RNA sequence: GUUUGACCUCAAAUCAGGUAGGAGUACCCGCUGAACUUAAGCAUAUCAAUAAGCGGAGGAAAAGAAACCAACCGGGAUUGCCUUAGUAACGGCGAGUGAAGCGGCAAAAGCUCAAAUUUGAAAUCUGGUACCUUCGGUGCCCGAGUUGUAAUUUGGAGAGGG
RNA sequence: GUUCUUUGUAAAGUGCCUUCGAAGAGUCGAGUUGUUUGGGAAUGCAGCUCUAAGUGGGUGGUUCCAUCUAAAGCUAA
């Protein structure tokens, strides 16, 4: 070649990268339970059937509870603002439970909200209080 | 739901139709309906436009220009 | 009649929530202290530029 | 004398604006609202300046400085976008729609006077997009509308409608006819 | 809205209003340069549905091209619209040609209004709807026919009818004209 | 008012800040385009939608989420490989040219604008500028912008209320 | 993993009821000369003439039926 001829002749030095052994054996990353139980001497599909998990949901072309219990173990195992709370304080102290009157009030229910919104928000207020 | 009616676009097309006036051939076409009739009107429209189905919709469109302008 | 029968939204009658968003953003900025309130801004010029 | 290129172009465009016969949906402009009625339209419209960016910023910091430490009606302003004005006509919420006579592409606002006559919206083609711009915190506005109003200004607005109907729409019933620009 | 009134207005081109508009503007565009910049779109409706947002970084250039091509029918099989798009691509080399539309036509010249985005503008580099144009795979889309009209002239679509040019006619020619030989001969 | 002021368009500036050219070019996207040759001598045709020429990109490019294929008991973006298959079709029906759907497989991923008012509020953005925890953030100011920047909406609907 | 922040009557999703509800034009198309394709069905494209419609329009299949949504844009392997 033209450029390669000079680069193999120059005293600059080649940017040699030996990244061939890293192409075959890539470490499993996304799950530490799988990361501890993965036999690197076995292949991908062999390490799936060893653990139990299905590797391909479509039936493959060609010819083909030890750990899943640990997964099952770790898988079987919204507050209100100061102003919103004080707003619901005002509504309860002036009305109580008359949601028709409570939502037809122009002074406290400035946002013309329904009855269902009011009873839900007040019960959130009542659960967090006495 | 091929060409869903759309009350607004029918209004808009007809709103622009009355404002913009008529193209010089359509201006001849509406004179040609009153004098010579739909026979020669469709003949000129077919030569002017692409196909016969074009000339159907166009002469009828112009007949509705006349039907609204004269009566109502 | 108007051309379309579009139902009018709640927000056209209720006090605006974009306004409420901006107000409750400046509120945070005052708690944090990065916006000095309009009342104290007079006091910053009553003491300075004399 | 010898003028520049652009000066010659705008002078040529000025004389071209006169000397051509023009379609009646244009020249429905320039048959516009006279000096007294224009001044009286703005004597109302100036009372509803949309709250300028500085005024809005200072007030909403006043809300924060007060309400965070220790009821209002919906305020009325003029409505000013073409998407929004042609939205408001056909709602039908517009009581007075003001239309500029000088628009950069003329084709923009050609449907608007006749759509206003269709909907029954009392429109007035007023002179100057700059003059509309002034009442609305913008350089230019093309359109300005007055949906709702304070009751103090309500009777004045209703009379502004009736004055514009009589002054504009009745004097210019001939303007839907007659191709403009036959000046010799 | 307002643009539906505009859209259906510009569908009537020989109608007396738009006839007059086009009469004035064709002459006015002759008096200017060949490629010059437009202050704003003449057809803002069609600009916007071709993706013009009226914000900082968005440019409208107006362009003029000669019409036509058996010496006088020695063909030149590329469009007038692609020629126009390329010329504005060279005068405004910092921009990226987004789309273009027809504005006015004549015996000698067809006019267009190209729409251009500034990929170096920070109002384009943020906002995740338009920052795709900053990716260097869009350096001169108009020179490789990646615009609307270029994809038309290339004949890129779907179906039976575009089999000779669906992945590009050069690609499909090179693929189907290849003696593919395997290790164990088929 | 014979004055003053809005705009519109067009300029300039060693203005502030940016950006384009040239190289390489195997592959990739375009434009432009022959001939020797082969056909019986030969305007079609063939070599060939090739070589040469010109432009334009990247690690891939292009293509791509149907104005697709089909005719089924229907499939479902593109691209690629086996198959279709030297089949259908083209061609002095001559030399010769010559696919695609289906089936298998590789790989797979979906989405976004414009068009219906935020109108109880241009909610949007760039720059300058002073700080800070600096691929940025915050404050203030000049602007862009209603001839439309934001949020919502894209047919698989979708939106306003309850 | 540990830890600091979260807020505002803030942003969503599910199912039902109730009220509405637009879809890319010198573009499709037609003619036409030229190029091009396996594309005889006139396969694509380019130039020029003329130039549409919205219970639209395109593409196929023996009285009709099926299947797409053009003329705007992005996207790995």
UniProtKB/Swiss-Prot annotation, chain A:
InterPro entries: Ribosome_biogenesis_Nop16. It is found in: Nucleus, Nucleolus. Transmembrane segments: none annotated. GO terms for cellular component: nucleolus; nucleus; preribosome, large subunit precursor. Keywords: Nucleus, Phosphoprotein, Ribonucleoprotein, Ribosome biogenesis, rRNA processing. Residues 1-8, 15-25 have a biased composition (Basic residues). Residues 1-28 are annotated as: Disordered. The modification Phosphoserine is found at residues 79, 81. GO terms for biological process: ribosomal large subunit biogenesis; rRNA processing. It comes from the Eukaryota. Belongs to the NOP16 family. Component of the pre-66S ribosomal particle. Interacts with NOP7, RRP1 and RRP15. Present with 2860 molecules/cell in log phase SD medium. Involved in the biogenesis of the 60S ribosomal subunit. This is Nucleolar protein 16. The lineage of its organism: Eukaryota, Fungi, Dikarya, Ascomycota, Saccharomycotina.
From Swiss-Prot, chain C:
It is found in: Nucleus, Nucleolus; Nucleus, Nucleoplasm. It comes from the Eukaryota. Component of the NOP7 complex, which is required for maturation of the 25S and 5.8S ribosomal RNAs and formation of the 60S ribosome. Present with 2680 molecules/cell in log phase SD medium. Belongs to the WD repeat BOP1/ERB1 family. Component of the NOP7 complex, composed of ERB1, NOP7 and YTM1. The complex is held together by ERB1, which interacts with NOP7 via its N-terminal domain and with YTM1 via a high-affinity interaction between the seven-bladed beta-propeller domains of the 2 proteins. The NOP7 complex associates with the 66S pre-ribosome. Also interacts with NOG1. This is Ribosome biogenesis protein ERB1.
From Swiss-Prot, chain D:
It is found in: Cytoplasm. Belongs to the eukaryotic ribosomal protein eL8 family. Keywords: Cytoplasm, Ribonucleoprotein, Ribosomal protein. Its main location: cytoplasm. The chain holds residues 50 to 238 of 256 of the full protein. Present with 238000 molecules/cell in log phase SD medium. There are 2 genes for eL8 in yeast. It comes from the Eukaryota. The gene is RPL8A. This is Large ribosomal subunit protein eL8A.
From Swiss-Prot, chain E:
GO terms for molecular function: RNA binding; structural constituent of ribosome. Keywords: Cytoplasm, Ribonucleoprotein, Ribosomal protein. One of its GO terms (cellular component) is cytosol. Pfam families: Ribosomal_L15e (PF00827). Residues 151-167 have a biased composition (Basic residues). The keyword ATP-binding does not apply. There are 2 genes for eL15 in yeast. Component of the large ribosomal subunit (LSU). Mature yeast ribosomes consist of a small (40S) and a large (60S) subunit. The 40S small subunit contains 1 molecule of ribosomal RNA (18S rRNA) and 33 different proteins (encoded by 57 genes). The large 60S subunit contains 3 rRNA molecules (25S, 5.8S and 5S rRNA) and 46 different proteins (encoded by 81 genes). This is Large ribosomal subunit protein eL15A. The gene is RPL15A.
């Amino acid at each position: 070649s033209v450029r390669k001829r000079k680069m193999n002749r120059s005293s600059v030095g080649k940017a040699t990268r030996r990244n061939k052994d890293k192409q075959r054996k890539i470490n499993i990353q996304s799950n530490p339970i799988i990361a501890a139980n993965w036999d690197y001497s076995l292949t991908m599909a062999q390490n799936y059937k060893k653990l139990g998990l299905r590797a391909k949901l479509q039936t493959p072309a060609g010819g083909k509870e030890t750990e899943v219990v640990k997964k099952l173990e770790e898988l079987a195992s919204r507050s209100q603002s100061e102003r919103e709370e004080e707003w619901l304080e005002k509504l309860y102290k002036k009305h109580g439970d008359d949601y028709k009157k409570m939502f037809f009030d122009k002074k406290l229910n400035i946002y013309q909200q329904s009855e269902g919104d009011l009873k839900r928000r007040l019960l959130r207020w009542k659960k967090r209080n006495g | 739901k091929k060409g869903a009616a759309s009350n607004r676009t029918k209004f808009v097309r007809s709103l622009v139709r009355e404002i913009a006036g008529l193209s010089p051939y359509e201006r001849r076409l509406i004179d040609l309906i009153r004098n010579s009739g739909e026979k020669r009107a469709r003949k000129v429209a077919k030569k002017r436009l692409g196909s016969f189905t074009r000339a159907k919709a166009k002469v009828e469109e112009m007949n509705n220009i006349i039907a609204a302008s004269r009566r109502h | 009649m108007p051309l379309t029968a579009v139902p009018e939204p709640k927000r056209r009658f209720v006090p605006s929530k974009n306004e409420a968003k901006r107000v409750m953003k400046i509120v945070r900025a005052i708690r944090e202290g990065r916006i000095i309130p309009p009342k104290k801004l007079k006091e910053m010029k009553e003491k300075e530029k004399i | 004398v010898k003028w520049p290129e652009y000066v010659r172009v705008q002078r040529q465009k000025k004389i071209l604006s006169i000397r051509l016969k023009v379609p009646p949906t244009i020249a429905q402009f320039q048959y516009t609202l006279d000096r007294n009625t224009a001044a009286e339209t703005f004597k109302l419209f100036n009372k509803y300046r949309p709250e300028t960016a500085a005024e809005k910023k200072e007030r909403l910091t006043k809300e924060a400085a007060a309400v965070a430490e220790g009821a209002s009606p919906k305020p009325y302003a003029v409505k000013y976008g073409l998407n929004h004005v042609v939205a408001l006509i056909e709602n039908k919420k517009a009581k007075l729609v003001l239309i500029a006579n000088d628009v950069d592409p003329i084709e923009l606002v050609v449907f608007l006077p006749a759509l206003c006559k269709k909907m029954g919206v009392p429109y007035a083609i007023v002179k100057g997009k700059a003059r509309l711009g002034t009442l609305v915190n913008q350089k230019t506005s093309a359109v300005a509308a007055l949906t709702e109003v304070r009751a103090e200004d309500e009777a004045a607005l209703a009379k502004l409608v009736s004055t514009i109907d009589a002054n504009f729409a009745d004097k210019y019933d001939e303007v839907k006819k007659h191709w403009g620009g036959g000046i010799l | 809205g307002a643009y539906k009134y505009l859209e259906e207005l510009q569908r009537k081109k020989q109608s007396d209003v738009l006839r007059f508009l086009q009469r004035v503007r064709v002459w006015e565009y002759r008096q200017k340069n060949v490629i010059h910049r437009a202050a704003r779109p003449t057809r803002p409706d069609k600009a916007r549905r071709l993706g013009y947002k009226a914000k900082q970084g968005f440019v409208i250039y107006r362009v003029r091209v000669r019409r036509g091509n058996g010496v006088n029918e020695l063909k030149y099989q590329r469009s007038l619209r692609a020629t126009a798009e390329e010329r504005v691509g060279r005068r405004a080399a910092n921009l990226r040609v987004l789309n273009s539309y027809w504005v006015n036509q004549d015996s000698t010249y067809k006019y267009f209004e190209v729409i251009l985005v500034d990929p170096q503008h920070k109002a384009i580099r943020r906002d995740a709807r338009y920052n795709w144009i900053c990716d260097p795979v869009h350096k001169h889309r108009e020179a490789r026919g990646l615009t609307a009209t270029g994809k038309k002239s290339r004949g890129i679509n779907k179906g039976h009818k575009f089999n000779n040019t669906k992945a590009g006619r050069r690609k499909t020619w090179k693929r189907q004209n290849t003696l593919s030989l395997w290790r164990y001969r088929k």
